[PDB]
Amino acid sequence: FKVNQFRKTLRHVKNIVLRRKNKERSLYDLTDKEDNVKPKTIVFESFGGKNYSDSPKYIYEYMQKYYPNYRYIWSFKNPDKNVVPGSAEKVKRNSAEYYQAYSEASHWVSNARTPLYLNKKENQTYIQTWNGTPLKRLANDMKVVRMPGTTTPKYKRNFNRETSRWDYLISPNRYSTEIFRSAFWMDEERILEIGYPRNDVLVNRANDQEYLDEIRTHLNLPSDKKVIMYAPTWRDDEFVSKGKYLFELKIDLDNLYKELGDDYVILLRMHYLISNALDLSGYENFAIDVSNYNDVSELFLISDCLITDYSSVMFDYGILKRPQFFFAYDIDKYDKGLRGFYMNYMEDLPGPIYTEPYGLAKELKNLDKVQQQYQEKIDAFYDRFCSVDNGKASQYIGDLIHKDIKEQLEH
Amino acid sequence: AFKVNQFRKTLRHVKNIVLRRKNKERSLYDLTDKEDNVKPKTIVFESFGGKNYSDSPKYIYEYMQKYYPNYRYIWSFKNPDKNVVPGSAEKVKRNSAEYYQAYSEASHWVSNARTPLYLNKKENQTYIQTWNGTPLKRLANDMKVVRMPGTTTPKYKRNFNRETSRWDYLISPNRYSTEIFRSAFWMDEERILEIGYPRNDVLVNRANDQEYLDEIRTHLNLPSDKKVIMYAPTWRDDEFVSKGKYLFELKIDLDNLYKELGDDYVILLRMHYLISNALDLSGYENFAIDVSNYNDVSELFLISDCLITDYSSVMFDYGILKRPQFFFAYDIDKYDKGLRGFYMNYMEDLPGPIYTEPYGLAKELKNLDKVQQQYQEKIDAFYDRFCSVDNGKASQYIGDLIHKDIKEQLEH
Amino acid sequence: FKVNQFRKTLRHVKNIVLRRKNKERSLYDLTDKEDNVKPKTIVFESFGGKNYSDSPKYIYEYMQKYYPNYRYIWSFKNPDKNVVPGSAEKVKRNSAEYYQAYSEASHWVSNARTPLYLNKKENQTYIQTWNGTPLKRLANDMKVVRMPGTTTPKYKRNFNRETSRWDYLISPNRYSTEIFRSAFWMDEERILEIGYPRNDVLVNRANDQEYLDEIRTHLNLPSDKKVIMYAPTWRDDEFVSKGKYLFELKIDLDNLYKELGDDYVILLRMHYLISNALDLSGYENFAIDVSNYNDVSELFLISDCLITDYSSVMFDYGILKRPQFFFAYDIDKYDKGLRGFYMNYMEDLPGPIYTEPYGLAKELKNLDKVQQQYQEKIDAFYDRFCSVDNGKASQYIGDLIHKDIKEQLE
Amino acid sequence: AFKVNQFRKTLRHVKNIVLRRKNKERSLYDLTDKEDNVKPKTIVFESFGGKNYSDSPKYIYEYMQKYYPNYRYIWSFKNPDKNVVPGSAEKVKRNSAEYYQAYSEASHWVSNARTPLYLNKKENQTYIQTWNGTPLKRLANDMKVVRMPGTTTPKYKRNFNRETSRWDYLISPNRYSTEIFRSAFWMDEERILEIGYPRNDVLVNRANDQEYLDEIRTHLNLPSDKKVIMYAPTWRDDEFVSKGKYLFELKIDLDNLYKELGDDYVILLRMHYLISNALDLSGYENFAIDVSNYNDVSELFLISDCLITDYSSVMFDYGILKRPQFFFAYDIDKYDKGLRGFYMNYMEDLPGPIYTEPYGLAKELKNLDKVQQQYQEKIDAFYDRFCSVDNGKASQYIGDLIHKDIKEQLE
Ligand SMILES: [Cl-]
Ligand SMILES: [Cl-]
Ligand SMILES: [Cl-]
Ligand SMILES: [Cl-]
Ligand SMILES: [Cl-]
Ligand SMILES: [Cl-]
Ligand SMILES: [Cl-]
Ligand SMILES: [Cl-]
Ligand SMILES: [Cl-]
Ligand SMILES: [Cl-]
Ligand SMILES: [Cl-]
Ligand SMILES: [Cl-]
Ligand SMILES: [Cl-]
Ligand SMILES: [Cl-]
Ligand SMILES: [Cl-]
Ligand SMILES: [Cl-]
Ligand SMILES: [Cl-]
Ligand SMILES: [Cl-]
Ligand SMILES: [Cl-]
Ligand SMILES: [Cl-]
Ligand SMILES: [Cl-]
Ligand SMILES: [Cl-]
Ligand SMILES: [Cl-]
Ligand SMILES: [Cl-]
Ligand SMILES: [Cl-]
Ligand SMILES: [Cl-]
Ligand SMILES: [Cl-]
Ligand SMILES: [Cl-]
Ligand SMILES: [Cl-]
Ligand SMILES: [Cl-]
Ligand SMILES: [Cl-]
Ligand SMILES: [Cl-]
């Protein structure tokens, strides 16, 4: 007597009869067999289906060029609002096609967690690129998580469930592997220290001027000015008033304009929620909202320096050996002498830590003085965290997948 | 790998449960019935589709009650509160949760008729079919047409075959029946037990037990000085009319019977239930006793000095007593003329006279010893063909087979 | 949540999960709403979708000319093997498109029973042309039906369920009307005595020579020769040997070749199982096989006489007032004095009964004499069965449909 | 024809029936529970979730036994065979068919703790909640955080709130508790009954019944010439170690207490059940008596000349006797320093001294009368604020309200 089949049937009958939107899900759970799997079908999703971006984008673009005869499926929250190059067909999350796609594909490629109601058969290969060298503690390494609806243990039980389905897990650096192996409950075998595919352009194209010039004129940037990128992490604290009118960025734009307006334009990469509350009138041709731009790596390439605080992008951008400033206005509130980070944040990062934005501005005045004054520290950072990206990472995965699926076209 | 048969049952059950269908109990049963539900020491009995406590299953039960008390006995009825069973046995109602339990758990099914096809007989269970009499009329595979409503002949036979293929043992009264059963029921001879009917054991063991004869006689308030005629005509479709409120008095003419025999004889009328409760025996009290609703027909045989029937299978059971029999076949013309829709040659080798009218019949009944003498030959011949098999040990043979069957189950 | 829907709902989960082919149907049963009806969609199917032919063909061809702007859908067993003129799109039986079409259509037009799993809603108009004046008892009027799998009462129950859905039933004559009212449990209110649309050409085209010539040279017929058509009904009796080699026709082609070979050509219209068993080597240009020809009416037009036995076609061919012959060779088998026929076969049919071929051949020698000898009976036949055909049947229907769907557009 | 909520139950019951889930008795009860099921004179008692025959429910029931013998009284237990109930009541085992009939049929429920959210309190029933005592620790709504396994703070509170919404009447021992209940349990003062606790009736009515004081004392084999000290420390996670095989002897130092207090005292130790079965009181017979398993804690008070405790709701019950109390809070520092995780001002308005070391406690214990006088001032304050609301009639009040309710329902 098959007792799990019985439960899925009940559940599915309950869904059909009540007209629940998950009827499509329960049908998939009932009927999902190892035999639906067709070896030349590949699904990609990035950030839970929100973009066409990141390592899955670059993995997919590489494969479109060298292996065009496989079936490619992209998964999207809203497929109609996402443009995808090449032969790939797109599926809407939780649609019948979503589930066919995952039931059928021999390889899943993602950069974040994919849902546990999806079945990763012994027959399929789930490759997790993940999404950056960690700074804040994550997964198993966390202490508390007062996240509504779920306890710390149940949140970790679930995370561990998901990481066990990871067949391969890409890695950028020894430091990260040491961390992943613990945080994600990983077997080092499954880890591939080959760098992030999304960071291929940062090596392969860092000098292609024709290419830097399409990115710049696609953003309408001034020809005479250098580019400062500012990418603060999301903060819960600073949300108030429906989010209708925020208090001008802590970084003081009026001041930056007075200081830097002659030599610089600043790209602001905020959380989407801050992005549509920002009034940038008075700052046109100096402050450029850029939150809603598909490819952040392209933004790095055209950036002469980077301002952030507690973000993983600092490791990505470090590949370019350009200066970085850490405007950490709220560093006090963050646990004083916080080890809530895997690295020693007070000591070995590539640039100056500023708690106020006014000395930051002055420092920025002359970029080259920073570049020498921190070349010692920059190179060091490059050596720990970036000395592994080849620019061949998309290739490596792409080839692995191809190689993987030749095996399956025999026995 | 997906279990499709299970899936189908789950849907069928969900349907019944949600729709508030009476058959929910059945589908719950179908869905869960494991081979591991069977308890070797449990045994179900049913007779005639759960109408009675009677017939051969009754007598198998009563024997095992005596020599094998520690087993679990279940009896199945349509209406259990209206049936009385001696002994340790419990009773379940048909189509009830307890009914399906019982048939699920039982290592042995005992009955005398078809049991439904919605019951599942596992490789785990032994189904003993005693059936219910030496055939006169063609049955099952041997019939030519069955214009029975809703159903064709092929499909009626297809279903009967489905049933008999579940019969682990089939009881047989005589070589004649074994020949027929082998054909009509698609039976392997290996499975036939030629041992006579457990219900006919009393016909051998007790024909001379005067005290027992007397309970039966007194239970029926029979006058003492009076000999006993049993009349048992088969049912006839033709003769049903008027919602069945008032029937035309019996062809056999009771008024005439009373005039000719009302002094020496009493006559027991074993009719079909629909005639029985339409009969008006006003004016024949102490001469014509209705006995249709009497629970044990063999007891009626024991106190019967002769039988009058027509086209029944009882003529075969009553034949063990070697007493006189009369066949009042008034409608024999209508029954196909020179008909072989009977297994035996009805026109030659029965133990008595055929009478198309009831008046010659009565004159004959006047002198019973002359009839006995007149036909002894034809009687002894009928006895040798159809009744020379009953040891009166049929009830015993079956109980000892069950008992032996379940011992070897309980060890292993 | 309604019980009838829960029932359909469960059956479809069954089909979807079990991959039953009937999933298309259970889906259709679920979403079949009265609102799906587009008042200007019309479906046509003839003989259960084997053909593009018969009375539906003609109602269709008429509407194509005078009502081009409607959605015409034709339904077939194998659409890729059927050629349909005009604006009609075609669908396969039991496909999603099949159920769409039938759900959406404001009008069903066919000449045979269409299946009970299709829902004819209050909203739609089912026009039944049926397929000919009966000679054999049908439906309610059959005494017994020992047909495999089903019982006589259950068979009539299902036929009754189908006829109760026919909003209009066509009728060729008063005799047919009388029989339909009983055999099909029909109200006279619902019968249209107007004649078969398939018969339109028999009245309108019988003197069209350019048309008779197309039909003739398409069949590759000799030119100086007159045409006999032979159409025997099928007999279970005569099927043997898997059907590989049959016994040559009781009509005796050799004899007919000897006797008529110089004056006539003869068209054999046989049951499809006999057609692919017939060897006609030795008779090229004398005996042509015409069993697969799509349009039987045209074969009548170019026929100078009809030889049949027990067929509803005699009634059709009667419109032309030409000679007919009845080669009833097995007529003794058929129940001796059988009244399992509605009409008095032994008497009033339009030509002589022959039980042997050879007297039939002598007779065929001189047709004109036959026409004379039987003009009285041919006329009485024409009067009783064929004098209803205006030639306007296809028009009447197409116009009825047109009038019917002008109302719904409000 | 079929309603949605009944469909969902109908499906849950199918699951339990087919899968042989113990919970089938529950799903059936959920399907069949009708408002007509209720029998106006059936009454169910359960205390501390069925572990006991005890507390306010026992006493409400003992009253209603003497005065209303004609009603159907049902007691509910985890293990009914391990409990003895005086009177006509029939016992039922939790989660059995009988359990659910009992709660379905009863016109009135009586409990001193939370009854399960799966039981339906029909609009037909009256659920009287005695609760279990004047709080000192913040409870329910008023807790700040509860990192309790399997559940979150907001989820925990939602569930508590669902449960109190079902309380028709809530007993209260004092206005202090009323002010608190109103907030913590989301109550409406309409529903609060300030009658004092039933369990505390014998503290008033029998403080002098010498034949009754004597039965208790000889049930316990207590020495004749000796006075009684009771100690009742709350449970502390910290002190559990080693599977709980061998504990570290109590901080109070029994050896000392014996030397100092032996010639005049005997000490009743009422510990957690887990410490009780770990205590080796060998060499202390007739001095320290293990009293942890005694059914009726109120009897224990009656016979106590004083009470040593620490952070307990039982100080408020004992207060009724206007006898001395000591608070041996050895771990007071650990407990949040100046903790306001209490409702009252612990450092100030309790009816005795706070001791962090046991040696002064003992030297003080020496002369009761000296403490009774030195502290009368505070014992009387305590007794006005927390203990002045006890009639001795709480059981009668409750009993009489039930009776009154079920005369109406008898029309
Ligand atoms: Cl493939
Ligand atoms: Cl390829
Ligand atoms: Cl979309
Ligand atoms: Cl990360
Ligand atoms: Cl869970
Ligand atoms: Cl970003
Ligand atoms: Cl299932
Ligand atoms: Cl057993
Ligand atoms: Cl035994
Ligand atoms: Cl009953
Ligand atoms: Cl009984
Ligand atoms: Cl029989
Ligand atoms: Cl009579
Ligand atoms: Cl009988
Ligand atoms: Cl309904
Ligand atoms: Cl279906
Ligand atoms: Cl339309
Ligand atoms: Cl038009
Ligand atoms: Cl096709
Ligand atoms: Cl048809
Ligand atoms: Cl219909
Ligand atoms: Cl016809
Ligand atoms: Cl049918
Ligand atoms: Cl007529
Ligand atoms: Cl031939
Ligand atoms: Cl509802
Ligand atoms: Cl449950
Ligand atoms: Cl009551
Ligand atoms: Cl127990
Ligand atoms: Cl509730
Ligand atoms: Cl409390
Ligand atoms: Cl207060």
Side-chain angles (χ1 to χ4, degrees), chain C residues 128-142:
Chain C
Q128 178 66 244
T129 69
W130 194 242
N131 59 64
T133 296
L135 162 94
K136 298 163 180 259
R137 307 186 82 78
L138 42 37
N140 201 12
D141 290 358
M142 284 183 196

Side-chain angles (χ1 to χ4, degrees), chain B residues 38-42 410:
Chain B
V38 168
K39 303 160 184 169
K41 47 176 67 157
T42 290
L410 231 30

Side-chain angles (χ1 to χ4, degrees), chain A residues 1-2 4-10 30, chain B residues 2-11 31:
Chain A
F1 184 85
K2 262 183 113 75
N4 294 326
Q5 166 181 321
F6 172 82
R7 286 191 295 173
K8 314 201 213 186
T9 297
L10 258 38
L30 248 186
Chain B
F2 204 86
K3 243 198 124 70
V4 11
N5 279 334
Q6 169 183 306
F7 176 71
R8 299 203 273 153
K9 317 201 184 179
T10 296
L11 262 39
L31 210 201

Side-chain angles (χ1 to χ4, degrees), chain A residues 181-216:
Chain A
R181 162 149 59 165
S182 159
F184 286 146
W185 303 265
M186 287 301 297
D187 307 344
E188 170 146 5
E189 285 181 338
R190 278 155 153 156
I191 282 148
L192 300 168
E193 280 188 32
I194 61 169
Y196 288 116
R198 63 136 109 108
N199 286 343
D200 276 1
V201 269
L202 294 203
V203 185
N204 306 337
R205 301 260 240 161
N207 292 321
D208 188 349
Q209 264 286 2
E210 187 196 7
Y211 180 45
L212 292 193
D213 280 353
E214 288 184 14
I215 303 175
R216 296 173 57 80

